[PDB]
Design a binder for these strands. Sequence first.
DNA 1: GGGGGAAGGATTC
DNA 2: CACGGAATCCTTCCCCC
Length: 341
Amino acid sequence: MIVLFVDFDYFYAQVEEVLNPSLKGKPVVVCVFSGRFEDSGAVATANYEARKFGVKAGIPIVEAKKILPNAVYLPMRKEVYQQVSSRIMNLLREYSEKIEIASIDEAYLDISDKVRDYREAYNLGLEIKNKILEKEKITVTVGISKNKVFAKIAADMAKPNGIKVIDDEEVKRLIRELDIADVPGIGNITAEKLKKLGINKLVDTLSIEFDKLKGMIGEAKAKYLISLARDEYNEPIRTRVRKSIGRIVTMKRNSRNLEEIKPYLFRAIEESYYKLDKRIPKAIHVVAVTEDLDIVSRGRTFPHGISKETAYSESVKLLQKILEEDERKIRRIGVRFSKFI
DNA sequence: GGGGGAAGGATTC
DNA sequence: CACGGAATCCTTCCCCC
Ligand SMILES: Nc1nc2c(ncn2[C@H]2C[C@H](O)[C@@H](COP(=O)(O)OP(=O)(O)OP(=O)(O)O)O2)c(=O)[nH]1
Ligand SMILES: [Ca+2]
Ligand SMILES: [Ca+2]
Ligand SMILES: [Ca+2]
């Protein structure tokens, strides 16, 4: 099997440069301003001129202007990035039918057919790299390997804007050398539970009795790591379909008053229905982020679609169920719609 | 002992 | 001080073969 992985570099920031070329070369930071105060918010991402100094996705904007006071700080523009992404995804459909769009800027191309070996695949990468760069002025990193996880690992290793092929030969040396933490799907939490069991490398998952492993990280992830270890992992490339849709806004002041939160909740519902773009949801979830950033939610599934009024009246109930069952103050509030008819 | 759903939470990118 | 959107899992609970 030959799976090619494409990943747009520092995407949001790089799109911002495309829409305004005079930004090339300068440190750029795409932000999400909460409106809780002067420059309150977080960093969605930044180009590399700013990533070298520590600025990066996740960190606050206040903590970012301390390091790079003169960087260009732009507000996030989802809508736009969504379009640009889509245009680029449609260019990839030109190279294969078996394509999986894993996120706004990840994509896996299945080319087991149209290729014989990695050298006949390497060129295919450049044909795509130097094609998106041309049609859309956007730079990307290509990862090539026997399967998805390794196609993905390849890309991680060649960024920014590059291309690395990981063939059957090397895959074997990585199942040994490679640090388990850098394996797609092993966050800081899973990466720790594993050190605790002496599994610092992919190959070490064979020296532990499965059951002891199924208790520590759940069965799904256990079979997962193992498959990779015994080099027999080969998940197909299916077309993932949207299952839920939502919006979570941040409030100006962390509160608990029902009438103070309702407005935000509604504004979230309005946008949620807009995005629903003529899709009827059977399930509604009211999610909230407590004062200590813990995420709490309550929801309900109906036996029929949820009209907008239903949505309004039902979300106010699920909310009270949170302010009741929980006592902490609420920072961010939002909704999620799922189980589409 | 299941199937099978639903609900609330964990964890990853 | 740290936004935002969605997917896959896990555990528990429930009704009832
Ligand atoms: N709002 C928000 N968006 C994020 C966050 N992290 C990642 N994203 C979004 C914006 C990124 O452009 C997009 C896709 O790429 P990544 O997620 O890989 O970020 P980036 O483009 O820097 O990837 P790269 O490190 O270059 O491989 O995901 C985050 O913490 N908050
Ligand atoms: Ca990226
Ligand atoms: Ca990525
Ligand atoms: Ca990792």
